[PDB]
């Protein structure tokens, strides 16, 4: 895969069955030196070209199966491997237009073996005070293209 | 089996465009999904690059290949092979050795679903003409190719002109044999009009006009959509793409236009050829309609 | 099965040192061969990183693992697991859920050949003490661990002192139970004397002297050979390595010293942690003799 | 693998059976957009810390099998894949000492579909006049460490 958290492969609009664009997807690799169970994940907020999209619009597909935030919060047995990027599916009727798009996405995960000061105040949309690169940044960005007909 | 049924010219990608990534940051499946993000269905592989354990892939690998094609709606279009009768330093291969190698590649191409071969031969002069026994080589394999529904196509690219000797040698052979299984791949570098200031151009090269392709279209079975530079308006700034595509639409072309990028910057640290190809496919989708 | 029969301390590598490369530019086999270039035999893996389809690898993967161990003369030494009773946001795991998770990791560690587990637990205070039911958790798994010949070891690392409360809590438990299957992993950061000018150091931290390890050696089953900086004379410039290694040699230590590098520059573009580890292993081979 | 031609993994001294160091090995990836048959390969000259070592001291292991230069020159059926670096084994009694070593190695391969001007004058130890990166450089360098006891 790619070094960046947001992968360039897998970014695309999602269609219906009935042909209507219902949203779009992109992939994120776990930037951690080990995998996590789904209940450790803390999804955050997406910004697409400045437009804010809250986590309740975004599902997570891991190991071929799609999970809501609530489902993930309760599942401590399904494991997310560092080599298997999650697919995030964003509800957004009509999707993204042709051309460039700037993505900013935040998420993090719990590491209960870390010192309590570090654990407390863990926020998917804000960085730790002291950056440890083996945990990655909570917030990550990427400028990517969508292939689509003209507006 | 996914089939793509659009009438007229269709778009795709040649995996050679990923030559700096393949095996390093992209797997074969990453390339398939990269094509899928673009909505591109047609693919070109290089026999000597993209087939594990080439020349003898396992049944298990072949089934994984077909599963990938169905998973990402990829149509195997063009299979790139070399008939390298100069593979040995000390001698040329006999006609029979060359035919045996070619037939094996036709078999493998058929097994993976391809219908067009981009066949490359050793060249013997500055006109890039093939080895002198090439007709014999091709005639040795044509029955098999006809039986398996494969079309073998040498590639016409700069500086070869669409009205030059090379093209006419191939067309003459096609007319003399009557074969429906040997044809041409036109690489769009033959239409390039714009070059950078101080960029060396072969004095032997003269751009062809789009209409120059019209009398060859009965024999053109696949094309390399070569491109040099995509602007941020998603226009190609060196080749008259609108006019080339409109010419082929209006004159009955039913094959594919497979994006091919060969810029040296593919090998620069930080380059993102997938984004370059997405620009090119914004262009191609708007020109083609799908 | 490759076995490494050197008497006294032996050297190896913890794959955590490759955390910026694993899955990107290094495969598991690349790490095995990287250890082989160093002549290092002992390995530490992270359960949640290096086992495909964790927690339930296939028979086929397990056989590939054993083949790699024999091919590169790798001894599986230490297996890193987490007993994360805080895995759920809304509640703690019960003692029984934690024991079930731990026993599964002991089973998998035994199947892959490991004899030491570096077990990490959620911590509840600034002293980094484990969850309050930890003794119950460990006592739930000790029979299995004794049956399968596995030793479970929490890791002592900065700022925890070898004479502090954490260490004495573990030693007390070992003495009270009499178990031969729970012990200590000493990370060499507890001996670090040199720091950069203006580098923040925890006021609670005080370097231990090498001899401070001597009374704990009956309970030390594996060590993280942590290191900060290797000079071009292949000397470690922050920890008294000669004296630590000589202390453990002279006092009967038979386990491994597994290189662990955690510098932030692992994640810098162009960094080559394999070369850093080779420097460290020049040091370790000269201190140990093999 | 690695972007560079000379890989960092697989660089080490070679021992005997009788315990004596007979030489050393390192790996090279084919820097070509396609694989080649063994008879297309043109091995060149090695320099280790300035010491010149000629190709007749160096064997090539591809697909698990070891080939001499002469064997390779005649074998147009064994295929070298771009994803399977060759192992070059260098005869050199005693091998390399502990510490750093500077490697410079040259090789190339035939591409008979290229224009005759380009083909003629193809030399494993000298670069083409016009660099085409999809063919790689003929000559490549790397500074690598050997783990060994002190001299
Ligand atoms: Mn072309
Ligand atoms: Mn440690």
Numbering used by the authors:
A (entry chain B), D (entry chain B): 1 to 151
B (entry chain A), C (entry chain A): 1 to 290
Could you give the paper's own sentences about this structure?
Here, we present the identification and structural basis for the activation of xenobiotic C-glycosides by heterocomplex C-deglycosylation enzymes from intestinal and soil bacteria. DgpA catalyzes the oxidation of the glucoside moiety of puerarin to generate 3”-oxo-puerarin, in which the 3”-oxo-sugar moiety is cleaved by an unusual C-deglycosylation enzyme complex, which is an α4β4 heterooctamer of DgpB-C, to produce daidzein. For clarity, the DgpB-C and DfgA-B complexes are referred to as PuCGD and EuCGD, respectively.
To elucidate the molecular basis of the enzymatic C-C bond cleavage reaction in the activation/inactivation of xenobiotic compounds by CGDs, we solved the apo structures of PuCGD, EuCGD, and AgCGD2, and the co-substrate structure of AgCGD2 with homoorientin, at 2.50, 2.40, 2.30 and 2.25 Å resolution, respectively. The major structural differences among these enzymes lay on the interface between the α- and β-subunits; the α-subunits of PuCGD and AgCGD2 (represented as PuCGDα and AgCGD2α, respectively) were composed of a TIM barrel domain and an additional domain with four α-helices (lid domain), which was not observed in EuCGDα. Instead, the loop between M121-N133 of EuCGDα, forming the active site cavity, was six residues longer than those of PuCGDα and AgCGD2α. The difference anomalous Fourier maps of AgCGD2, PuCGD, and EuCGD suggested that these enzymes contain Mn2+ as a metal ion in the active site. In contrast, EuCGD acted on C6-glycosylated compounds 3-5, but not on C8-glycosylated compounds 1 and 2. In the model of EuCGD with orientin, furthermore, the B-ring of orientin also clashed with active site residues including Leu128α and Pro115β.
